[PDB]
Write an enzyme that holds these catalytic residues in place. Sequence first.
Site, PDB file in Angstrom:
ATOM      1  N   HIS A  41       0.835  -1.232   0.000  1.00  0.00           N
ATOM      2  CA  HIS A  41       0.000   0.000   0.000  1.00  0.00           C
ATOM      3  C   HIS A  41       0.861   1.270   0.000  1.00  0.00           C
ATOM      4  CE1 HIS A  41      -0.079  -0.222   4.563  1.00  0.00           C
ATOM      5  NE2 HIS A  41       0.093   1.083   4.382  1.00  0.00           N
ATOM      6  N   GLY A 143       2.559   6.095   9.752  1.00  0.00           N
ATOM      7  CA  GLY A 143       3.940   5.957   9.257  1.00  0.00           C
ATOM      8  C   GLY A 143       4.651   4.744   9.835  1.00  0.00           C
ATOM      9  N   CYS A 145       3.855   1.577   9.393  1.00  0.00           N
ATOM     10  CA  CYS A 145       3.747   0.448   8.435  1.00  0.00           C
ATOM     11  C   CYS A 145       5.133   0.066   7.929  1.00  0.00           C
ATOM     12  CB  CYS A 145       2.793   0.799   7.307  1.00  0.00           C
ATOM     13  SG  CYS A 145       1.080   0.709   7.892  1.00  0.00           S
TER      14      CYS A 145
END
EC number: 3.4.19.12
Lengths: 305, 305
Positions: A41, A143, A145
């Site tokens: 993503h 942030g 991820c």
Amino acid sequence: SGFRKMAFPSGKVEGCMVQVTCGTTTLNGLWLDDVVYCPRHVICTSEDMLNPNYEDLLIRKSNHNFLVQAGNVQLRVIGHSMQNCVLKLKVDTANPKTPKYKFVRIQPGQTFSVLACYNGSPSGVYQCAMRPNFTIKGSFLNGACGSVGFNIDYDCVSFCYMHHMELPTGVHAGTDLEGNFYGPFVDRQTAQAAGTDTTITVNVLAWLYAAVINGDRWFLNRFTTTLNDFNLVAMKYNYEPLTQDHVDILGPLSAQTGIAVLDMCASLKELLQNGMNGRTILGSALLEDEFTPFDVVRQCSGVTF
Amino acid sequence: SGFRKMAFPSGKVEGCMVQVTCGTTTLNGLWLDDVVYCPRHVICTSEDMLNPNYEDLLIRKSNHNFLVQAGNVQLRVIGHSMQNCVLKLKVDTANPKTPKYKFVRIQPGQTFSVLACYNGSPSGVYQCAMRPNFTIKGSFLNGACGSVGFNIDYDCVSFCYMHHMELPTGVHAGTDLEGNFYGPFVDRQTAQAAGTDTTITVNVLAWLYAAVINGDRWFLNRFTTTLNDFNLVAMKYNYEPLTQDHVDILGPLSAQTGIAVLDMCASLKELLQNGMNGRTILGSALLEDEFTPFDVVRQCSGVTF
Ligand SMILES: *C(=N)[C@H](C[C@@H]1CCNC1=O)NC(=O)[C@@H]1[C@@H]2[C@H](CN1C(=O)[C@@H](NC(=O)C(F)(F)F)C(C)(C)C)C2(C)C
Ligand SMILES: *C(=N)[C@H](C[C@@H]1CCNC1=O)NC(=O)[C@@H]1[C@@H]2[C@H](CN1C(=O)[C@@H](NC(=O)C(F)(F)F)C(C)(C)C)C2(C)C
Ligand SMILES: [Cl-]
């Protein structure tokens, strides 16, 4: 003595963390040899993430569209593929700090350390259990991820988790390093909730053994139980079934303390039926289920890496 | 979202850990530039430690009597002095992995990460508070001595603790890196107990702000209090006095949530007088005092190193 929630030392993993920027989205990547692994993503905008077609968005990216930075050094991407929900970016430089490593898919009940990272820089390290409902109880901001979970066995880092998303009730969901979700979650912004959780019975028993080892012994009763009788009472309090494999895994702690697993089962059944009457165990007013038998032995016998 | 006990990443400290052997005693050392710092009781046998004369035992040691190993590399000692309860061993090699660092003496109430080490190898990392009675609630086995506590500010490691000993009730005592004990403890095997502990009031308030931020809001009442009125009720439950400096330090969390420190004080006074009635805050059935205001901001705003 003493018993703490204890993470693995994070040095080996710190040397693998990079920042991945695609368009305006930045998140963390894991750089092992000449490959950077990150959540797919990263190729989305805000709009995209409600219902993204990842195969479509990726067709349309060049190698140069991915900006990969390790400190203030830029790595040049020379290749890009998708494996399930994870992006693999081949880079022109092998990471000289690559540890010995494996990719592992852990079972529900197993613990690991999370290295929480923002912009490819480590924020903190903490220990987590894969819950029976395939969630973890993490601490992740925007942030985070691409932050990874790991175990260490002497020199070898086993990576088992990559962070993707947060579910209602602020529990977290992610993938193995082959990009398959733990549990039935998908990487899109829609209505998703965790199944109701259960208590990891074998871990509570491991914790009760740690209490005995540390001299916290008030909850030991003079009774035994059958596995069958124990698992009926467990079921009412939303505790996992205790299997014979669970009993065999508790053997070391049982042999160390001289308390048969089924005697500790009798002690836990009394705590469940009667509660703790305002008393604590290892400082806790609740039963703890995020220490495995292996974690108890590590900490109580001083295993190093 | 989520709120966890979170240690600093330990990589910078892992590269500084060595094994120190003198006679048959082995423990951990901290190698910074060309100096190894370790607990001075490495120069003792079993017998010695009841009432050792350290100045005497040290007179009688050569440089060669200290075996210092970083992995399976031996460092050659070329100098040895004592500073309070810490040994300084000059070695022939500067540690190439020396981070930017300072030695700091922390105040009671402050948190730090412990890197628990055995034989110069890191076992685990966990977060600790310096208690008002100058103890920490650690997890340390035989051989853990010379394990260090630290904070990280971007690139700089501030070392504040070196582990020396365990007190009755399995709490721990140690020195700053200049070798002065926290609290009134001495490095000999005799009758020593901690003063009774108190609860670090400013840290409980910081934790209550973290709960609000994470959407745990049931304990907020509609009342205010005076600092004076709050500190009378605090005193009965063995809570530290809350000073005006404490109020000013809570300013950021107060401004972020829009709850005046004295409104949160009113909420805490009610929890102390009435208890939690079987309810939890951030998953805990007890009030937590091992998160500082800075730790809450770090975790809830994602500060990295
Ligand atoms: C990656 N940096 C973030 C980490 C999140 C943000 C807040 N705390 C975290 O752990 N991941 C995401 O933003 C992912 C990302 C889209 C939506 N998202 C979510 O975590 C969302 N969750 C869900 O949609 C739900 F409910 F299914 F879990 C959000 C509402 C933003 C928390 C994608 C691709 C899943
Ligand atoms: C160094 N590796 C150990 C670490 C200890 C051992 C058990 N858990 C720990 O944290 N340090 C020591 O063995 C120090 C050492 C002599 C005695 N000692 C103690 O910690 C003892 N404590 C005390 O004598 C007391 F009560 F004062 F705290 C012990 C009874 C072994 C726990 C010296 C030089 C202080
Ligand atoms: Cl608790």
